[PDB]
Ligand binder design. Structure first.
Ligand SMILES: Nc1ncnc2c1ncn2[C@@H]1O[C@H](COP(=O)(O)OP(=O)(O)OP(=O)(O)O)[C@@H](O)[C@H]1O
Ligand SMILES: [Mg+2]
Ligand SMILES: [Zn+2]
Lengths: 358, 649
DNA sequence: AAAAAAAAA
């Protein structure tokens, strides 16, 4: 069947270390407790985790002979599994709301409360956590000075070009640099899909992560599980959970292209609150996860092992420059005071446009 | 069965006999280890064996490789992998990087004999045999990764599973095909999550190579063959580059032998799995005594005249044209500014004259002697396809740009004949490119700026059959003033009738046609030859065999051979970047002012561009004598050349 | 998407 191999990585100790770091970290008290508290009060909408914090915490705790392994290396070698571990750990230690909440507006929670008041009244289904989650997990790449602080070569970053990325970088966390040319619109995408069951008790749920989805035909309701059908299951748009989806592509800069070559492209997917954070025609450096995508979407029954690849966005620096719409600020106020004190200005401005032409 | 073990141990004995490959493996290991954790280049796990030594050691194994590589190469690479696994010493390895299991695939060099073929010569009886094919790259595909071995994990078991996939084009030996279905369930039903970062992916690219048009049968078109190469060397060379590819030529696919056939007239598919690639270039390196010769010759007072006279010895006259060609092939340095944008760096030459004055021949010589150049004619080209084209890929089904005529000639030189006879519309492409050395394409949803910093040389004949000296220069040339103003130098050539020069050129041309190839009699015509004996090729300073260059004695002044001149220009274009001084500045400004206010008839009007041309020529002449600073003599010679090219002696 | 032939302005 499937032969087995041994790897030096075991996730139990890593999960315990993750919990210890998330509970004990001191940079106000714990930062990671305050942000979770703000999430609980329905104030924050996204979570950012700084790998530099983990690196420095491990480096300073290595002074005592307790730590045995490194976690940022495992993050670099694999990311999505650690995303799942992080969301599980966060949901495990989610704090209590210390503030009032406008509880009537949460239609999803009202619907789930009605479902519970139905099911547990008769003495209930364990809803998956991703349906109940409200936050989003994002990562932040390290900084080169932090790496220079220590002897270890925990570098990452290094904004490779589009063509410099090769096949062995799949699954890691990488940074790319280039110009954005095409940005698509915002379109909602499903995360958890729910079906109404025609008053047959609990409403069956389904979860799909692939880009292709298939619906249900029969349900596990007890009276529907009876020897004759009781109502056809239907998909309910209100109960299901959605997420914003957007895709773009990035072009290599004219500087980095070797002579006699045509610049290449790279697709990129962005989900969550980072949607609409980039515009066509700018120089950026995106950090994210480099993931494969099946070729079966084209459905040609060819390319038995060839597959397409894309990047998943995690953090972006807009870079370039800002016009700012001449927003008023003190510094430019003293600058225009200097200009006023400069006296006649138009001749100087004419002199200052193109000194190259005489 | 045991034949695999016997072959493996025979190859182990062969590797034990020759100690060079072990040294290479140790060097690559220590270099990789040093690159690992010391404050980006990584050497791929590939080694090249010279099968001449293998033939000198064991003829049976050599013949087995050269006849049936399928049953011989895998044991050899297995033995190499085992030797590497025994030699290396890494007591503290990583986790994801230790599972690469790269088989250390090989490369070959040496004499092949009857297996060094051409794309036309490949036939049925050469199948399943290691071969080396020569040709020119015509097109390439995109670099797409493909999967080999996937790693799976289940939370409950804690045991990481792995499944290995192989395709027809992945391995030499045909095995049972495997679909790309991801295993998501264990034998006991445990859920398996695919683990990225531990699986294996390798690059994939397909290229096509065709036989050279020169060595083709009369009245026949060139034919092409396709090459698959992966892992290393995946993005080497480019379209328009002479290559020699060594690999295994094998068939693949059912080819309609199953029920899918619609007619009985079905042929199989043939394809070559490349093992290594080499650049032909009809070599490009320089030795220590080469440097000594270059320096001692550059210390001479008359280097520029010798080099100018060394170009096309069979062309009589046109001395300053040869000098301009020499300055053009190794032109001035490019200047860039954070505020001044871009400054053009090379020089363009245009020639116009009456028929039969040796313009096309000199252009062909420049094409032959240049490091990189592309041949183009005005009538047989279209501007839309001359810069970029949109075509659909057969594999992916998408549409991607194809490089045009001068995009392939980036940082090279483009030679165009019948420039005046080209359609006016296509000229706009030149108007686009020569302006800023950048072509922008925007069509069918593709937006990209392509770099093209090539230099263009053109030759065109005047509107009339023969040049009219008594007429206006503008009305003698069909091209508009806008493009004529860009070209740095305008040269007009006429064959004035003079009995003395007629006699001299007549005896020279008659001397040329009485020539005999060495070692060949005069009674029979020139016959074709085979390739070099080696498929792959490779006391000091006391010989001067091909240094002095005076192969035959006919004049007191010296002459140098072409390959040494190519070596000289290669050295000069890289090792020297000169700077200018105020002494040359004084001469430049003085001669510019004198030329501009002389107020006499001239062939072409001048402007600020001519001074910039003078500066570029001064830089080029500062490069020609291998100096880091510009001397006023360079300014003087540039001024003299310009005055000839604009006034005439 | 790009090359090449034909009738009308
Ligand atoms: N100075 C010369 N020395 C030797 N051969 C010469 C010289 N001038 C002309 N010829 C000869 O003139 C012939 C004409 O060649 P070619 O057509 O290339 O010349 P061209 O001047 O470029 O002509 P065109 O304008 O018709 O293209 C060639 O065979 C060449 O050898
Ligand atoms: Mg000619
Ligand atoms: Zn029902």
């Amino acid at each position: 069947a499937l032969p087995s191999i041994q790897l030096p990585v075991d996730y139990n100790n890593l999960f315990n270390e993750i919990t210890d770091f998330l509970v004990t970290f001191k940079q106000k008290g714990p930062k990671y407790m305050a942000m979770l508290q703000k999430v609980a009060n329905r104030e924050l909408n996204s979570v950012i985790i700084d790998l530099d914090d983990i690196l420095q915490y491990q480096n300073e705790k290595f002074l005592q002979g307790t730590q045995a392994d490194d976690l940022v290396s495992a993050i670099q070698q694999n990311a999505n599994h650690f995303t799942e571990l992080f969301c599980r750990a966060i949901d495990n230690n989610m704090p209590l709301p210390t503030k009032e909440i406008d509880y009537k507006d949460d239609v999803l929670d009202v619907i789930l409360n009605q479902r519970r008041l139905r099911n547990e009244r008769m003495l209930t289904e364990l809803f998956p956590p991703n349906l109940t989650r409200r936050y989003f997990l994002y990562f932040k790449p390290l900084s080169q000075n932090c790496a220079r602080r220590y002897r270890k070569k925990a570098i990452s970053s290094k904004p490779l070009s589009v063509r410099q990325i090769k096949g062995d970088f799949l699954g890691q966390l990488i940074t790319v640099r280039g110009i954005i040319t095409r940005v698509s619109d915002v379109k909602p995408a499903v995360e958890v899909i729910a079906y109404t069951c025609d008053q047959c008790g609990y409403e069956v749920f389904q979860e799909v992560n692939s880009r292709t989805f298939t619906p249900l035909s029969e349900c596990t309701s007890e009276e529907c599980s009876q020897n004759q059908t009781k109502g056809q299951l239907f998909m309910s748009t209100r109960a299901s959970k959605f997420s914003a989806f957007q895709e773009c592509k990035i072009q290599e800069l004219s500087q980095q292209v070797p002579v006699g070559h045509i610049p290449r492209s790279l697709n990129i997917h962005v989900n969550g609150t980072l949607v609409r954070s980039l515009s066509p025609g700018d120089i950026v450096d995106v950090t994210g996860i480099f993931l494969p995508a099946p070729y079966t979407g084209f459905k040609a029954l060819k390319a038995g092992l060839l597959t397409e690849t894309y990047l998943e966005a995690q953090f972006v620096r807009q870079h370039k420059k800002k016009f700012a719409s001449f927003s008023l600020t003190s510094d430019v106020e003293e600058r225009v005071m200097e200009l006023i004190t400069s006296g006649d200005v138009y001749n100087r401005l004419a002199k200052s446009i193109a000194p190259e032409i005489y | 069965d045991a034949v695999f073990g016997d072959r493996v141990r025979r190859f182990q004995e062969f590797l034990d006999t020759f100690t060079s490959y072990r040294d290479s493996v140790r060097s690559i290991q220590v270099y990789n280890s040093n690159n690992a954790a010391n404050y980006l280049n990584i050497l791929p796990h590939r080694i090249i064996i010279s099968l001449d030594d293998l033939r000198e050691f064991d003829r049976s194994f050599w013949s087995g490789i050269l006849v049936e590589p399928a049953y011989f190469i895998p044991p050899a690479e297995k033995a190499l992998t085992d030797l590497a696994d025994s030699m290396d010493d890494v007591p503290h390895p990583n986790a994801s990087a230790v599972s690469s299991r790269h088989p250390w695939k090989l490369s070959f060099k040496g004499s092949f004999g009857a297996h060094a073929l051409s794309p036309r010569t490949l036939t049925a009886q050469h199948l399943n045999k290691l071969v080396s094919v020569e040709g020119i790259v015509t097109k390439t595909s995109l670099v797409r990764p493909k999967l080999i071995r996937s790693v799976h994990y289940a939370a409950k078991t804690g045991r990481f599973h792995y499944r290995d996939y192989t395709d027809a084009t992945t391995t030499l030996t045909t095995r049972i095909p495997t679909p790309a279905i991801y295993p998501t369930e264990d034998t006991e039903g445990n859920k398996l999550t695919t683990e990225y970062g531990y699986s294996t992916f390798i690059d994939h690219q397909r290229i096509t190579v065709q036989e050279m048009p020169e060595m083709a049968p009369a009245g026949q078109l060139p034919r092409s063959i396709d090459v698959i190469l992966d892992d290393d060397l995946v993005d080497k060379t480019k379209p328009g580059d002479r290559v020699n590819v060594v690999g295994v030529f094998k068939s693949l696919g059912a080819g309609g032998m199953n029920q899918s056939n619609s007619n009985t007239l079905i042929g199989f598919k043939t394809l070559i799995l490349g093992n290594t690639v080499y650049p032909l270039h009809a070599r490009q390196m320089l030795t220590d005594f080469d440097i000594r010769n270059i320096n001692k010759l550059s210390k001479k007072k008359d280097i520029f005249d010798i080099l100018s006279q060394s170009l096309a010895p069979s062309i009589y006259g046109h001395d300053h044209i040869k000098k301009a060609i020499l300055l053009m092939l190794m032109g001035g340095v490019e200047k860039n500014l954070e505020n001044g944008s871009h400054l053009r760096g090379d020089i363009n030459i245009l020639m116009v004259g009456d028929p039969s004055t040796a313009k096309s021949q000199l252009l062909r010589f420049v094409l032959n002697t240049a490091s990189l150049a592309i041949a183009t004619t005005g009538r047989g080209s279209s501007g839309v396809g001359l810069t970029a084209a949109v075509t659909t890929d057969r594999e992916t089904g998408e549409r991607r740009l194809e490089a045009g005529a001068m995009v392939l000639a980036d940082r090279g030189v483009v030679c165009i004949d019948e420039f005046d006879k080209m359609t006016d519309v296509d000229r706009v492409a030149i108007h686009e490119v020569m302006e800023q050395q950048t072509v922008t394409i925007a069509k069918a949803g593709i937006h990209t700026t392509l770099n093209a910093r090539c230099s263009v040389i053109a030759a065109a004949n005047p509107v009339f059959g023969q040049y009219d000296v008594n007429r206006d220069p503008h009305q003698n040339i069909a091209l508009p003033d806008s493009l004529l103003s860009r070209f740095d130098l305008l040269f007009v050539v006429t064959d004035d009738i003079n009995e003395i020069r007629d006699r001299s050129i007549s005896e020279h041309v008659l001397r040329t046609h009485r020539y005999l190839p060495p070692g060949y009699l005069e009674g029979e015509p020139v016959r074709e030859r085979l390739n070099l004996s080696l498929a792959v090729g490779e006391q000091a300073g006391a010989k001067l065999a091909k240094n002095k260059g005076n192969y035959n004695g006919t004049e007191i002044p010296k002459l140098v051979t072409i390959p040494f001149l190519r070596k000289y220009v290669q050295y000069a274009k890289e090792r020297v970047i000169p700077q200018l001084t105020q002494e040359a500045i004084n001469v430049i400004v003085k001669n510019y002012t004198d030329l501009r206010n002389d107020d006499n008839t001239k062939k072409s009007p001048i402007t600020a561009r001519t001074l910039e041309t003078l500066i570029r020529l001064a830089t080029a002449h500062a490069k020609v004598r291998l100096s880091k600073t510009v001397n006023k003599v360079d300014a003087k010679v540039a001024a003299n050349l310009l005055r000839f090219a604009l006034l005439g002696e």
